[PDB]
Design a binder for this molecule. Sequence first.
Ligand SMILES: [Zn+2]
Lengths: 78, 157, 211
Amino acid sequence: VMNVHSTPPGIAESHWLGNFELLLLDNSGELDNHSQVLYDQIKAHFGIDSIELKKADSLIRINKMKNKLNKIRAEKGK
Amino acid sequence: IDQIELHLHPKWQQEVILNLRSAFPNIQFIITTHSPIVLSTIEKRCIREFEPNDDGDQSFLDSPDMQTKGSENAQILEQVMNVHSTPPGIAESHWLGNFELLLLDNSGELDNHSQVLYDQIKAHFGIDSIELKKADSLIRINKMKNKLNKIRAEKGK
Amino acid sequence: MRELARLERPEILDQYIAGQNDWMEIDQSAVWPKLTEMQGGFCAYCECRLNRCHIEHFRPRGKFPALTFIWNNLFGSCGDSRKSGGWSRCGIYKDNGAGAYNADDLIKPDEENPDDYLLFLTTGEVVPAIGLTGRALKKAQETIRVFNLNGDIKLFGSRRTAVQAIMPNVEYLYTLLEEFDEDDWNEMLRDELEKIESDEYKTALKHAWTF
Ligand SMILES: [Zn+2]
């Protein structure tokens, strides 16, 4: 209704979680190097129990239940 | 500055503090506010919670527990200001919680006291609303969990 | 709550006897190991992480003395008063904010199981379990009232946010029921149940995961 983002657009920390998914989905699952850097920056700025880290860990665990079906692709593989 | 958020739209509150600190880098700014949108642009260490007592007497002003520099406005509203994201004084805001109990009442299948509610929600919020998506997800979870219970009963017994 | 097994006593507890000296005589730090290990560093009333924690006498020595120095009337509760603040939840709110409550009418997580007493919904609110009638239901309502499980926003909103984060995971995990076999799917369920063990809200996520 008000065309206002949930997080302020003028702060680098606001786009950190969006970037986490875009860099999780860049390697299609599997926290790599660039993704794991983003994850401790989120864990340091935001608390150990925050919506940001709780949602970060969800994206991890969900592209770990889907990479299992693609490691199930390793089971029907060739 | 007293009530920095006065006469400001939320979009302006999203950037007023940043603009002030950018234009006046070396000014010590001591401001008061009561809007979470302004607080979303301020570090946790810069915030002092003023909760007095019945005498107006506070001894030490405290900082919030959670960081408020990149957090969403609703999170700051509910965690720092103790304000519900949804209006507690409206029956429509409890429809998805009432509906969830009604699915779970009859084990998780839309019955009738749950279909009157699902289309009360569909008519009010709409097809593309978040509330209808949550209701559909809850329906799917209830059905899948029932099928689970059947499968685990087959495996166990 | 979760069922938290009151294990052995701590030893310091015997050196201090209720009536002869005030509870302040013993150090809460010594009672913490047993309580903390029992609760895995979380609240015994609202599952709040022990970041803000205090030894709570379930039966206030001032109203039910309940042998103040009995390890059993001692719980690894939440919040704290020496550091000041505006705590209106769980143990601190039980002693002062709630008022006019019966100690025996409150569920004790040590012996009473909150699984069949409390139901945690997806919306973050706690309701009495389904099918409760008469006396049994009234303990659930009473404990929700006095412990302020539904109450101060900082707990309800945080629990709801925690549950909403994992809901897409529950969705996708239950979508592949037919894609995987029984053993593998139960293994995924066990993996999720391990995940919620090292999580802030033990039982809300458990209720959102299994039923
Ligand atoms: Zn607590």
